[model samples]
Target: VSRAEEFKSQANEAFKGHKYSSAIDLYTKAIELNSNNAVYWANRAFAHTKLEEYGSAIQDASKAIEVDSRYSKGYYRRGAAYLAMGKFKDALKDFQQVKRLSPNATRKLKECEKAVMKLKFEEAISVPVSERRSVAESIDFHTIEVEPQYSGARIEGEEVTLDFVKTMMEDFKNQKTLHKRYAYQIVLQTRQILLALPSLVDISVPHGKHITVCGDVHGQFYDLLNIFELNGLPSEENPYLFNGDFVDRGSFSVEIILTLFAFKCMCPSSIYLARGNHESKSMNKIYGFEGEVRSKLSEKFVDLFAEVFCYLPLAHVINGKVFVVHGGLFSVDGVKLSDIRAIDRFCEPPEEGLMCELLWSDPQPLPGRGPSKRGVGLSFGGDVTKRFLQDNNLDLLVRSHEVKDEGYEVEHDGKLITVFSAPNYCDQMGNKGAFIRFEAPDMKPNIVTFSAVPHPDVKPMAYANNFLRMF
Candidate 1:
């Protein structure tokens, strides 16, 4: 066989094995040898589609059609790419042409029509606030009211008490805006406590009972409340550890952070907070927390919040059994528990380092370390996880970063567990949220899952910045 034909055969085999990246590479080699081959271009386009690189798929599919106008699959592939990218009008035209060229295009044509209708519906509902009832107007304030527990007073330089913190939580839950002074004081007090915590806080389960561990909240205030309702609230008896990503994405980030901070101050030993990737200044600036704080309060408050974020712990070791962190293990071999404990977490997460990976790395199916798809942290595999646990003499590694459909997932032969608490993420993913309950000497984990509950009429990401809207 010719070089191009040989590469094309290899590409087909790679694609059949579900190695889309390898197929893309082999097909590119085939295309380089014979650019006029429409089949090579179309097959590569299909590979791109499988990888969710629809933009590249559209380009390759267009090239295939350019090379041979009668290539029916090219039109069909391009139509599918356009449909995935939400270009309904373009997709509709391409699908029409596909139907004319090939009788097998019926399913694609139906999908294109549905997409057009969905786009129209989305456009119709996305109108100016003045044209319809505002989200605030749709909310029933009477139904949200709760009896006040405290006078919302401020004692200068006084330590935060559980009673006062509970009262603040109640007021916020009832949809009452906190006084600016009270809000600042709450954050200010919490900052002091956070600054005092070590980089890695080691916790001993009282009486051999494991504490409740929660994943990302992402500023879904009602969802956070739902977690507390399903599981008991954080107290001396029911201790809790919140793995990061507390702010950003959802609209009510300010409320979520403030409430968590209040709880931290109230029950410092009972409630532990770990920093997630979103807890950084750069992430919040892009993901909506900075804008939410500035729009709701002031630019000064955002600065204060950033300062507090710097002090949040990077990881936690629960009862010397479970390793808890915002993200997964680093790519480095022989990563000891002391290495994580020695990390100086009182700074912005570095672009590449142990600290950054701790708050950003993700697990992959590959057997070793790979470059991070996110462009910051590395994507570690089962070997990395196994070695990390074995090096630290630990059991299971518990981290929270990725959103799972069931709210949590056990992976790497049960060596690592990812728990995500923000259900119906961004109000679009339709995923259930979950928390892990560690009980008694056995330290058995019981996953408690809950779906998203009804909240105010405001949509998710309502307070997002312009940067977030682009993608």
Candidate 2:
């Protein structure tokens, strides 16, 4: 009983419900019913994005324009996909096309231009380690005044105790911002610890002890609190390895990062953090991290967080058996653990390299490498994973860069795992969040999946750029 229009309406409903796979199927039915419609093609492009199928998105979005050359949304959808894949110049051209189609109507033109400019500038000026001023040199807490009526816990001359962390977490829970001085101290202090660590920090989980490994906690502070509430806080007995993406997307990035840093400061040996792809300067500028910091703390702290993120270790090894990284394997063969340790990591993520691959790559089920839909890293296959682990004599490779409906996935004949900890990602993906624990001795993976708890009224991407907001 459904016509082309009716099918599109059902597809639209599914898209809104976050049933993106179904949305695409419905849109395909609409397209089959009426091949001349631009709306169905464009809507299918959107569903592809929700599934991280950027290649398909670009195809469908382009088809929208081919069917209806003057449709402004055709240009917009294609440009958005290009921007996400880091094809800035191509996205800019699409942005230009959208503007040419509607000079007085397109509100996204200015945002696209600004994003392209800033992204280009950041990539061009990827700073060297010698030139970057340390976080302490950038901010002076001693000179700043702490108000007499300020209620949050104070950092006593650089000491960050468990109590201060407790109060700070409580403060963030109550929607209270920590003092700028303490926020600065947390990152500054954590920066020192991270700088001393190697790119591949090895950990030994001793007999009878267990450690938890968590994936991206992209600024959803309340949801992060739920993780702790479920698994218990980071301590000597309950150590945790947060595998990158500590900031961006969700609005409370400042809060989540500060809390993680404070815990790192409180227990350096037990709390391990690796660098995710989103930890880069360009990502912060466009995503919510930079804006959230500027809105909640101050503008200067933006640089502070970006600099600190660079110093974070890119990968971690557990008991010489399990390998963990924010992303996955390399494009080239014969890359060893020593190569990862030797990477000069105190710079922005390059377009290609070992460091880039570690933070950007994803795993695929195919038997060979393929181009990343994200446009930065290569996606590896079961063969790649098996070979990497076998050559390195490791048991499992655990990564977190993709969202899974079950919060976790085991592939490559159960030798590789992907754990995504951002529940109902960006409040839209409708995926569960999970963590993996490897108990000492046997060191087998014990996975736990959980649902998204209620957060404050603030929506995800609360501080993202206008273009991203529009998308």
Candidate 3:
């Protein structure tokens, strides 16, 4: 066989395995050997689309069309790529051309039309002055007062007072440089508070209003601020429970974690923090937080943060009806609230057990337990969720880990809710972040979603070791 034929065969195998990157490499080699082949270009474009490289997909698909003007798949592939990139008008034209070439393109044509309408509606609402003003007023930026002692003082005590916490929050919000001593002190103080709490905290909501549940912040500091502005701030009247993954991936993990700790100090009972999979030393070292701390502060500070992370609670029970955790249910049957409560959370997370599953499991559409796709936890079915809820006498299980297109998803017959608060995750994957507000007595949840706002011109993943440095 020729080199191009060998490359094409290898590319087909990789594509079958869903390894788009490998397939792309192989297909590129095949195309180099046979540039005039329209099928090779179309296949490579499809692989690029699978990888979410829509721009490259468009280029390849367009080349395929250029090579063969009558190629129906090229038009379809280009249209699909355009749609993914939100270029609705361009996609519509391509899809229309596809429909003209192939009578079976009805579904693609309708999808393009729907996308065009949706884009127009979004554009219309985005421009109205009243709507823009309403949004601006909702997330108003203002300065908060800080006390002199807490402003620049070294935090060196067993307890973090509300006054000190308030000052710290004010300083952080104003973009003031936090001294390494102050950051260390804050972590020490926060650790004491978390250590006093149990593995599972049962939150009391006597009144029927003012409890907000947030999910996987993932180090997006500005987005977290937007969340505070959209929802009420942490206070006696309005309490907030942040459901894990508070660090890693983004540049501002340190700031995000410190701000939440300050909030905890200010309103210990009102602000609850749960442990996420990324809270582990291994995850942080791999995902970016450890490098961020080492570069911004020191290696010692990274260890200090890890010590604090060890104390974060694993789960929270709100109003006795909702079970909130970072991840979902265990693979084993009959896991109870008591099981979660009895977990000794002081050590690093173990490889496999109740504790691991509590911080790693994901819900699937299947009927029973299966191996985890993530390589760390189990993938549980809807029946597992129902059984777990019934066993715990809870109505809802709220978790954060997976990123949804809407930033939140209702799964397992509404028994499980996965809320993600990082919008446009990694500065890509155009997704809307959301939080859930639960009213008391009835325990009904109202979801509020927000889009990503402008931040400093710095790129996403700025703290990751693999990030490109531009000086």
Clashes of each: 0, 0, 1
Candidate 2's residue-wise lDDT over 1-471, tens digit each?
349888899999988888887898888888888978888899898888777677778888999999988998988888888876656778888888988998773566677777778777766876764597766785777777889999888888668898888888999998998998888778888888998999999998989999999999899888899999999999988999999998888888888888888888998976899999889877887788888888888878877777888898999999999999999999999989999999999898888889999998888887999987666688999999999999999999999998888899999899999999999998878899999989989999999999998988998777887677776
CA-only RMSD, every prediction: 11.7, 3.0, 16.8
For candidate 3, the 10 contiguous residues with the lowest summed lDDT are 135-144
Q: Any idea what lDDT model 3 has?
A: 0.78
Error of 2 at 470 (Å): 1.5
Residues 62-118, candidate 3: write the lDDT tens digits. Answer: 999999999998998888776554466897898898889887578767766875776
Deviating ranges (above 4 Å) for candidate 2: 1-16, 22-41, 52-56, 66-68, 85-88, 102-105, 114-129
lDDT of model 3 at position 117: 79
Candidate 1 residue-wise lDDT, 130-156, digit = tens: 244322233332333333563553433
Cα RMSD for candidate 3? 16.8
In model 1, pairs of residues that clash are none
Query: How big is the positional error of residue 27 in model 1, measured in Å on the Cα after superposition?
Result: 15
Model 1 ranges with Cα > 4 A deviation: 1-157
- Please give the ranking of all candidate structures by lDDT, highest first, separated by commas: 2, 1, 3
Candidate 2 overall lDDT versus native: 0.87
What are the Cα lDDT values of the candidates?
A: 0.79, 0.87, 0.78
